[PDB]
């Protein structure tokens, strides 16, 4: 159980596990919000997260608040 502040400013809760991947976290966010994972970027205390990793890779303790900022890509 962790929290993430959405783009609308609201705070949602996610049924997750430290084993689950960042991408699966975003899939749960898509189920809650609708923003597809390709259009997602998550910050934690001033640094971003990689999709291929899991929650344990960033040693995120349960019931932590994450900031969801909109991803933006460019070539």
């Amino acid at each position: 159980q962790i929290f993430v502040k959405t783009l609308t400013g609201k705070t949602i809760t996610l049924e997750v596990e430290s084993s689950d991947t960042i991408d699966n976290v975003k899939s749960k966010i898509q189920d809650k919000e609708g923003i597809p994972p390709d259009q997602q970027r998550l910050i934690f205390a001033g640094k971003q997260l990689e999709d291929g990793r899991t929650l344990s890779d960033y040693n995120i303790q349960k019931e932590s608040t994450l900031h969801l900022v909109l991803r933006l890509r460019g070539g």
Partner: protein, 169 residues
């Protein structure tokens, strides 16, 4: 246009009520489609203490197309006064969610600026240059940025007081 004026008027109130962290923005009083933002450099980034002026030019078909993003203050990350090629990662590159708030767009811009990703408009400098431009950014906006004085007259007054305090220490 009426739809965008009402939407952007709502966006401004939401931004006045709860401004995004490090970001200030307001629309040009003579053009609701042209917003002017000021990005304050975060602590961990080399842009710390920097006062960064830029524009958000919303198209006439707002809210159905993304705005054109530019940066005016010399900063070391983006080429000044150059439209930045920022798209939304998708199967179709020409995708724009009409429901994204202005604060959402600016927070994504700052998150990009803090990263190292390259795009049309990205410049390659060192870290000593980003810190130097961050220190002189306040001086630039106060004396060398005509659009800054027109849009942010009170912030110009905060800058001159700030620079006088910078002589101390």
């Amino acid at each position: 246009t009426k739809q965008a004026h009402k939407r952007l008027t709502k966006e401004y109130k939401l931004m006045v009520e709860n401004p995004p962290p490090y970001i200030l923005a307001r629309p040009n009083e003579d053009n609701i489609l042209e917003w002017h933002y000021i990005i304050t450099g975060p602590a961990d980034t080399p842009y710390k203490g920097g006062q960064y002026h830029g524009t958000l030019t919303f198209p006439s078909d707002y809210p159905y197309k993304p705005p054109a993003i530019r940066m005016i203050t010399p900063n070391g990350r983006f080429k000044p006064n150059t439209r930045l090629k920022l798209s939304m990662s998708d199967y179709h590159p020409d995708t724009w969610n009409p429901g994204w708030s202005v604060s959402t767009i600016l927070n994504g811009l700052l998150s990009f600026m803090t990263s190292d990703e390259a795009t049309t408009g990205s410049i390659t400098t060192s870290d000593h240059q980003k810190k130097t431009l961050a220190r002189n950014s306040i001086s630039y906006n106060t004396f060398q940025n005509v659009r800054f004085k027109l849009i942010f007259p009170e912030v110009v007054q905060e800058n001159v007081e700030t620079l006088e305090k910078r002589k101390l220490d």
